[PDB]
């Protein structure tokens, strides 16, 4: 017949191989395809949707207080309000986001991010903020004179209640890794900080402690590769009733 020989790699079950396999139910007629709304054909559709950052990932912020940042009227000039760890691949405010949870199924990621901050004060509350994306290399900037040298956006509080801090893809490498080393040149992204441009100024009938909801999506520049399993989920024992699926 046909003179063949087995290569190395014969009879091995690679999990990610793509080969046609034997149909269990022959001449099966699957259910006809109905137009179900909202088909995802590519996971970067899911990533480019905005999703809330937990910038307030502190203690004494229990549950939903972690999603908003309380900013107040300040008596000092040009004070730091918050800074955001930009490690998508590591634990931090970007982790439980749509750009974060999907990228923790991957290792190498590229493309520009997109931070959107929705002010949730009163309509009478007037204020201005600066949102400085500092490219990495140095420490997180604590004064505004240090931070506004980087990429920033200055935001007035009026009719439109949100800016977009585009985090540009500034990297030497084409992609960026996970390493468990947040301080690596291949993994570190930079630092987004926020400072009072002027101040949060409310009248006597508005609440003095207004809020900021911080979103992050990715852009059309964004890309992911080198798929891995997510570290966001674990499994110590069998789940409950999993033994009852066999009974």
């Amino acid at each position: 017949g046909v003179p063949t020989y087995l290569l190395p790699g014969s009879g091995q079950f690679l999990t990610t191989d793509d080969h046609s396999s034997a149909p269990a139910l022959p001449c099966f007629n699957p259910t006809p395809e109905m137009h179900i709304p909202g088909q995802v054909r590519n996971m970067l559709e899911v990533v480019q949707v905005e999703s809330m950052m937990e910038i307030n990932n502190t203690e004494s912020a229990v549950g939903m207080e972690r999603l908003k940042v309380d900013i107040s009227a300040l008596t000092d000039v040009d004070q730091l309000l918050f800074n955001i760890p930009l490690d998508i691949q590591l634990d931090g405010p970007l982790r439980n986001t749509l750009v974060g949870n999907i990228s923790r199924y991957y290792t190498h990621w590229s493309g520009s991010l997109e931070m959107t901050f929705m002010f949730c004060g009163s309509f009478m509350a007037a204020g201005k903020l600066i949102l400085c994306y500092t490219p990495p290399g140095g420490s997180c900037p604590t004064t505004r004179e240090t931070a506004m040298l980087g990429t920033h956006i200055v935001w007035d509080f009026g009719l439109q209640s949100s800016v977009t801090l585009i985090i540009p893809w500034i990297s030497g490498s084409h992609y960026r890794m996970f390493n468990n080393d947040a301080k690596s040149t291949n993994a570190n992204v930079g630092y987004v900080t926020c400072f009072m441009q002027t101040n949060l100024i409310v009248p006597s009938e508005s609440s003095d402690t207004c809020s900021l909801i911080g979103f992050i999506a990715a852009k059309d520049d964004f890309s992911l590769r080198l798929m891995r399993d997510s570290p966001d989920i674990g499994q110590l024992d069998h789940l409950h009733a999993a033994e009852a699926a066999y009974q």
């Binding site: 009879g11 999990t15 396999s21 034997a22 269990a24 099966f28 006809p32 395809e33 179900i36 709304p37 909202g38 995802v40 054909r41 590519n42 996971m43 899911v46 480019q48 905005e50 990932n57 502190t58 912020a61 229990v62 730091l80 918050f82 800074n83 490690d87 931090g92 439980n96 749509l98 999907i102 199924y105 991957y106 493309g111 997109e114 929705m118 420490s139 997180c140 956006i153 209640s161 949100s162 800016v163 585009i166 540009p168 893809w169 992609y175 947040a182 301080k183 630092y191 999506a217 852009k219 059309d220 890309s223 992911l224 798929m227 966001d232 989920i233 499994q235 009733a241 699926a245 066999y246």
Partner: protein
Amino acid sequence: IESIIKTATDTVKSEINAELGVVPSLNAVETGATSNTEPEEAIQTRTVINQHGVSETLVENFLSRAALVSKRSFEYKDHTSSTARADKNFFKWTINTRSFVQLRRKLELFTYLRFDAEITILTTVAVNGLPDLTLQAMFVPTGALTPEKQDSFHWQSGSNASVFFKISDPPARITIPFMCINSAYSVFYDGFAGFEKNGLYGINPADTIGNLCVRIVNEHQPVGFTVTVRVYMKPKHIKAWAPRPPRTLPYMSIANANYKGKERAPNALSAIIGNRDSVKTMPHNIVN
């Protein structure tokens, strides 16, 4: 606008923009739309021909990785004296994506999935020399008659798709088709299966593939063996609808989406993301 996107998009160069009326950084989250501020529109960019392929983020490539769905070590011996609870050389398994959390969290990213299961059954054996056992893995539909013995006459497989395979062979790989009565597998089923109020919440039997009754075709040998049968499911020909928040809290059960969370952050109930000192404290700071 539906368009074919094979690589990530290029970045056009931009110049100094000082224009009244056009404020592209200012956008409205309250509309629900994600902000359309291009990086050209926010900062000053160069021309970048981006050749980064988006092909590994395809939902076909996302979910077509053969992940574990079942695992039973079961004794292979004389079962004349064993109790009537353990596997007497066979196990039934209602085919269930919910048993193992890596594939479960990936399939629970979406609401509706339309996939073909590429079931790979890896059988491995340990002694309590190794035998070359032959195994039958009879595919029983949901709720149909499952066998009661190893040598019962349900295993004759008049119409159920049995697959006969050996331990020394490569692992048995069959293709379960798209077997839902609906046009997609309801991964989450906000509703009840029965018309009475006793039905189990969330468990749509249309989402259930069926039973995978697996026995060892050989008779009982004088020494006992512990046979571990791992089942690997590869979803393929995948259409996916309505993506969801990925589950952050640990799973409690396979029947429902109950949550307890970790005791402390990360992935706790009161605190999903791990804590830090203040909102103005940077945890991984480059201090030189």
